[PDB]
Structures are given as C-alpha cells and as structure tokens.
Design goal:
Elements (H helix, E strand, L loop, with lengths): L16 E7 L8 E6 L4 E4 L6 H11 L5
Length: 67
Amino acid sequence: PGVCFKVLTTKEPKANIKRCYNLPKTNNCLKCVLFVDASNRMKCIDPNASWLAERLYRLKEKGVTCR
C-alpha cells in the first residue's frame, strides 16, 4: 500500500486484523508493521512493541501473515 506513517501505534489494537505489511524506514516514513483491521482502518505498529510477536503468532495461526 502506498502509505507513509510518521506516527507509531504502541497500544495493542482490539479489533481483528485481516492484513499486515512490513513497511520500511525511508527519509519520509517510519519503519513499522502495518495492520489493516476488519473495519479497514490502518495502524502502523512500533516494531519494538512487546505484544507484537504474540499478536503476529495468533494471526499466523489464522492464516494471516505479513507481506
């Protein structure tokens, strides 16, 4: 997706996540893990978030892995 985050989400989203993406650091955009939730809203997670690995595990169990 052609998006560019300058703010990180740190709080764990409560909504179901349907897609995720690893977004790279650029001069304009932060490195973050992009979540698209079931309501089509985007939050780009701080890669340092403590809860993120477990959330990605749960997503993988459901058949959702990040692009």
